Every structure is written in C-alpha cells, then in structure tokens.
C-alpha cells in the first residue's frame, strides 16, 4: 500500500524495506531530499507517519539518538531506585519536623 507511493517515487530506487522488531514494521524508505519530501507527503496521503520522538531522540542523528536512548535505558533504573530511596530517607528524616 505504501509501495504504490514508492512506485510513484524513484522507481528502480527508493530503497524501502521493513526489517525487524515485529511490534511494528519499521518501513525505512530512502530516495532523495525534495522528491522524498513529496513522496512522504504522498505516503502520508496513503497513510504514514515519521518516527518523531520527543526531546533529542527525534531531534538528533539516529546513531546518536540510539546511543543516548541506550545510555538512558541503562542508567534510569539505578537512578530511579536511588531517587525513591533518598525520597523515602528524607521523608523518614523530616516528617515529624514538617508535621510539628
């Protein structure tokens, strides 16, 4: 259904396949800059959406975004555990003073 718009794009070109991560077929297409913008408009008319993440992951290069996302995924659990621990420690340390 999107390959019809890809046939409307660069015909023996627009390298477009969907590899893996079967929760969603990551259809990657590549032709050009401006003709690819027109083809992205035609595919969104056929129904399509770009991987627009928030923050910097949908705002930086994909290798750098993958590195930052992997770093945040490896770091967030110990940080959240320490955050809950220091929060509970501050609560158990100051709740009586706050109550008085």
């Amino acid at each position: 259904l999107v390959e019809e718009a890809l046939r409307k794009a660069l015909e023996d070109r627009y390298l477009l396949a969907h590899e893996a991560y079967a929760g969603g077929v990551a259809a990657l297409v590549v032709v050009h800059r401006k003709e690819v913008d027109q083809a992205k408009a035609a595919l969104s008319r056929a129904g399509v959406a770009e991987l627009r993440l928030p923050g910097a992951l949908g705002e930086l290069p994909l290798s750098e975004a993958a590195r930052r996302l992997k770093e945040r995924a490896e770091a967030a659990p110990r940080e959240l555990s320490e955050v809950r621990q220091h929060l509970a420690k501050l609560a158990r340390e100051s709740a009586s003073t706050l109550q008085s």
Binding site: V83, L90, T97, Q99, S100
Partner: protein, 50 residues
C-alpha cells in the same frame, strides 16, 4: 505575617503531599516565622527537586 504563615502552612501541606504523607495533628513546634520558613525551605527544595 498572616499571609506568610499561611503560605508556610500551604508549603508544608504541599511538602507532605509530594512526600505522600498526610496531615496528622501533633504537638507543635514553637519557632520563629522566618526560622520555621528556613527549616521548611531546605527540605521542600530537596523534595521538589527530587
């Protein structure tokens, strides 16, 4: 001074709320208004940042 004390009570209520604790009545702390504000502000700041 009443608005200051009322804002102090509101900040203590929000501090207990962000701490998740509930307002239980107890014997109070006789302290100065700015002194109690100074005691409130550091724990409230650490709690808000956390």
């Amino acid at each position: 001074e009443l608005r200051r004390w009322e804002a102090v009570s509101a900040g203590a209520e929000h501090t207990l709320s962000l701490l998740g604790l509930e307002a239980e009545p107890a014997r109070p702390f006789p302290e100065g208004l700015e002194a109690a504000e100074k005691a409130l502000s550091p724990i409230q700041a650490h709690a808000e940042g956390l």
